[PDB]
């Protein structure tokens with residue numbers, strides 16, 4: 001994985017260059033965004049279980065997905081689904097903190113689509129729940145932090161589709 | 162794996178239904194077949210080595226398969242082949258006892274065809290030997306148990322082809 | 323793996339035959355080549371680091387490969403490349419000693435091309451370095467041993483292409 | 484069922500089932516008619532059983548249907564009754580299989596994680612299945628009640644422990 | 646052969662062969678002419694060797710060719726003689742390789758499982774190879790018989806154990 | 808950087824970053840302006856810094872530019888100056904990242920294997936970076952020199968210890 005600083009450093013290193021003005025401007029942007037990112041990470045950590053249960057209530061409960069024939073039927077599958085959502089929120093928070101999506105490619109999305117397809121986990125419904133996580137999260141961390149989290153939750157969704 | 166009872170239960174569960182009359186009739190048939198299945202399993206267990214050596218004598222011995230260039234040539238390959246036949250008989254007996262072929266899909270056939278084709282193990286000759294196992298088994302457990310064992314030995318053969 | 327003797331034995335065994343005159347002639351050739359092979363193995367072992375160092379200097383140093391954007395840039399990749407060359411020399415020496423390339427198929431080339439293409443390791447430059455290893459080795463072990471080593475170093479190159 | 488369990492043990496040990504294991508299977512399979520009678524009696528009486536059970540449950544726990552309670556309001560209360568019918572159905576599966584496996588795989592593994600996420604009190608579920616057991620066993624003969632009680636008990640113990 | 650054995654040990658230890666291992670290879674490769682002479686002598690005399698051996702074998706074990714015996718009847722007896730020629734052939738491979746490997750991989754791993762499945766007595770095979778050894782070594786010089794005896798002994802010992 | 812370090816530890820423990828870890832990230836990110844000033848000062852003065860450094864290096868080690876020395880001749884000497892500029896650049900990366908990671912992954916893992924293969928003395932590299940440190944820190948304020956010294960020291964210690 002890389003965070004936003006290592007990403008800019010790597011782009012320079014592979015050219016054998018010191019960081020130029022444009023590169024330093026990218027670092028300045030990330031350094032200045034520190035308070036935003038750290039506060040949002042603290043809020044999400046403190047509210048992680050609530051965010052997931054509210055997202056599930058909005059997007060999945062009382063639907064076909066939780067009835068026999070649906071992929072959340074059986075307590076075992078219900079719990080597995082919740083666990084997935086716990087994962088997506090935690091890893092999106094990592095990526096938001098890092099200002100970089102690489103940890104998502106390396107540790108979330110790698111072979112995930114094939115795993116779901118083999119098991120019959122519905123992509124459409126999963127993406128709907130992640131989108132619900134995005135909106136619940138935004139209601140708590142505010143508009144500006146909500147946008148950053150939205151980038152990385154959207155990233156996971158795009159990677160599944 | 163499932164046995165015949167769990168298979169009927171699962172068909173009901175995925176619909177969120179109690180077992181109806183047709184489902185209960187399937188269970189009744191399986192419960193009534195208990196004596197047949199248990200007796201056959203005891204006979205096969207007691208005679209497992211004899212069944213395999215007699216099948217081999219009928220289908221593979223004195224043929225091209227056991228001469229140089231054939232896949233049973235060398236004591237190492239001869240013994241490996243016997244071991245496969247021991248497997249097929251034991252797992253077919255499990256499936257017969259369970260009244261369900263799922264254990265064959267999960268624990269015998271999974272990746273087996275690919276394994277044989279990579280090693281050069283002849284499918285045709287393997288199927289001939291399993292068919293010989295079916296007929297020797299039938300001679301010992303009788304006509305009726307012989308039919309049940311035949312279903313599951315045939316299942317393995319179809320899975321290889 | 324097989325050495326030259328086991329290869330000839332296997333060719334006879336799969337036919338169920340004693341070794342005929344032509345087969346014995348192959349064995350005689352290998353037995354007679356013993357002094358050549360053992361001396362070369364001793365020389366290469368004693369000079370393995372020098373051979374690789376000199377090959378790299380001839381084929382890779384001061385080129386695009388060792389500058390940013392090239393696959394040997396960074397001390398980590400530089401050292402990994404050297405380690406590969408150490409491998410190729412050692413396994414070619416095994417194969418030369420055995421008078422048989424099977425150890426190369428089994429322990430060097432197996433999945434190697436795919437590994438390199440996944441990592442972005444350049445095949446062209448690797449093959450150039452191995453060819454340089456061939457010429458440095460030939461300068462030390464002489465013309466006759468050089469030819470034998472050349473067979474197995476060329477074998478590795480063909481396997482990468 | 485009982486049969487699968489024996490087979491999994493045998494396969495683990497690379498062996499045929501033992502004479503003892505086969506005798507156990509034989510004994511299980513001769514008890515089929517009783518198990519089917521129990522399953523059909525519970526199925527036929529589901530509405531009556533669930534009604535008796537929910538009446539006792541909410542007499543003990545009226546707070547569940549008061550404001551702020553998890554079963555407050557008709558849609559939520561009706562979903563509780565739905566769950567009740569589902570656990571009764573799982574008990575019939577257990578009785579037919581002769582073991583807890585179909586109950587565990589469908590209704591117990593992850594059950595605490597699920598109901599916690601739903602804000603349904605797990606001790607409430609323990610109390611619910613306890614009076615479900617009372618209602619169901621009351622419709623069976625003494626012999627059949629004894630056969631059936633451990634399947635309810637398994638659910639109750641599972642929801643109580645760890 | 647001796648060469649591949651050294652190479653496998655070296656590879657296991659991520660190293661070149663040692664000076665000692667190389668000296669051992671050198672010594673093995675200069676003994677090639679002797680090994681080839683032994684191999685050709687046994688090949689040339691196969692029919693005579695197997696005939697002497699089978700005569701002694703069935704003088705000791707006439708029950709093998711009596712009714713109910715594994716070698717009863719011409720087809721079965723001839724298959725024993727076939728096997729005899731195969732083990733003689735494997736011994737020549739062992740002598741050429743300078744180790745037991747070609748004998749073991751073709752004729753010893755799984756040999757007891759095979760002959761048990763065929764109802765051929767493994768102690769009969771031990772006795773068979775013992776008198777095969779006698780017949781074969783009798784046609785070699787003292788020096789060559791000493792070189793060759795360990796390959797027969799390896800077969801005999803393998804079939805006696807486990 | 809410091810941020811990814813925290814994230815990797817948290818992920819290893821299947822948890823969110825702790826309040827303590829987040830405080831540490833906050834403190835790091837407010838020190839960005841200083842790190843950028845240091846990086847730009849070293850970049851701007853690269854030629855001057857490398858010149859002072861190489862002058863001191865080859866005063867101590869004239870044998871490196873004598874016949875048989877690794878830096879004998881203009882092409883080789885110029886490649887040394889090239890390497891010098893590269894390590895100065897890696898130090899600026901370390902300062903910006905707040906840890907040694909960008910230095911280690913690009914210029915230290917395998918560094919001894921590389922320079923040994925090039926016949927460049929590793930103790931010469933230790934001496935080279937020592938006087939590079941001297942030259943670079945001399946162009947910074949006292950505060951910034953203290954901030955920057957540990958990144959040079961890490962290189963020096965790495966190249967000293969096996």
Ligand SMILES: *[C@H](C)[C@H]1/C(=C/c2[nH]c(/C=C3N=C(/C=C4\NC(=O)C(CC)=C4C)C(C)=C\3CCC(=O)O)c(CCC(=O)O)c2C)NC(=O)[C@@H]1C
Pocket residue numbers: 065070071072077078080081082084085087091107108112115119121122125126129
């Ligand atoms: C919930 C929104 C939906 C749902 C999900 C569901 N997922 C699984 C099983 C798996 N999910 C994962 C996912 C991950 N594992 C990881 O390590 C990571 C990464 C950080 C992820 C994203 C995996 C690997 C599995 C399979 C292995 C396992 O179960 O641990 C299931 C269970 C499928 C089954 O029957 O076994 C389900 C039900 N299903 C839905 O319907 C939802 C919309």
Ligand SMILES: *[C@H](C)[C@H]1/C(=C/c2[nH]c(/C=C3N=C(/C=C4\NC(=O)C(CC)=C4C)C(C)=C\3CCC(=O)O)c(CCC(=O)O)c2C)NC(=O)[C@@H]1C
Pocket residue numbers: 226231232233238239241242243245246248252268269273276280282283286287290
């Ligand atoms: C005998 C009828 C024929 C024959 C068979 C033969 N098989 C192999 C090798 C393998 N067979 C298996 C099969 C299984 N392994 C399992 O765990 C199971 C399932 C429960 C099965 C069915 C496998 C995995 C192998 C490869 C690994 C191993 O050997 O254990 C061989 C040996 C091939 C070789 O040269 O290594 C042979 C000879 N060959 C015949 O000619 C027969 C018709």
Ligand SMILES: *[C@H](C)[C@H]1/C(=C/c2[nH]c(/C=C3N=C(/C=C4\NC(=O)C(CC)=C4C)C(C)=C\3CCC(=O)O)c(CCC(=O)O)c2C)NC(=O)[C@@H]1C
Pocket residue numbers: 060061062063066072073074075078547553554559560562563564566567569589590601602603607608611
């Ligand atoms: C009734 C005795 C108790 C009660 C229950 C109650 N449950 C819900 C909501 C849900 N229940 C389930 C249950 C299951 N899903 C399964 O796969 C299985 C296994 C067979 C079960 C048992 C689910 C998924 C829901 C969520 C909605 C949906 O069906 O999608 C409620 C609704 C309110 C809430 O969620 O809090 C209630 C009230 N409440 C009680 O007080 C009783 C002790």
Ligand SMILES: *[C@H](C)[C@H]1/C(=C/c2[nH]c(/C=C3N=C(/C=C4\NC(=O)C(CC)=C4C)C(C)=C\3CCC(=O)O)c(CCC(=O)O)c2C)NC(=O)[C@@H]1C
Pocket residue numbers: 221222223224227233234235236239709715716721722724725726728729731751752763764765769770773
């Ligand atoms: C003769 C000294 C003894 C003897 C032997 C005997 N063998 C058989 C039958 C078979 N022998 C083999 C042998 C091999 N297959 C191999 O791959 C190898 C390794 C090189 C060997 C040695 C086989 C496969 C057979 C089966 C038939 C076939 O060839 O397909 C018999 C036939 C009767 C029987 O099977 O019982 C006999 C009689 N019997 C003796 O008494 C001797 C001690």
Ligand SMILES: *[C@H](C)[C@H]1/C(=C/c2[nH]c(/C=C3N=C(/C=C4\NC(=O)C(CC)=C4C)C(C)=C\3CCC(=O)O)c(CCC(=O)O)c2C)NC(=O)[C@@H]1C
Pocket residue numbers: 382383384385388389394395396397400871877878883884886887888890891893913914925926927931932935
């Ligand atoms: C100068 C302070 C010292 C010195 C150095 C010197 N280096 C070389 C040649 C090479 N240096 C490198 C260096 C790197 N490759 C990398 O990926 C990295 C990491 C960022 C480094 C630092 C390489 C690859 C070379 C080889 C040539 C090439 O660029 O392809 C020389 C050349 C002579 C030689 O190889 O021996 C020298 C002289 N010599 C000193 O005395 C100093 C202590």
Ligand SMILES: CCC1=C(C)/C(=C/C2=NC(=C\c3[nH]c(/C=C4\NC(=O)[C@H](C)[C@H]4CC)c(C)c3CCC(=O)O)/C(CCC(=O)O)=C2C)NC1=O
Pocket residue numbers: 387392393394399400402403404406407409413429430434437441443444447448451
């Ligand atoms: C005995 C068999 C065997 C081989 C052959 C082998 C090769 C080998 N080379 C690798 C990497 C590598 N190989 C090189 C090689 C080079 N890059 C260049 O530009 C050069 C032209 C070249 C040197 C000649 C590089 C740079 C890597 C590292 C790639 C990376 O991780 O970025 C890797 C990936 C895993 C690792 O780094 O250890 C393997 C497996 N490993 C083995 O076990």
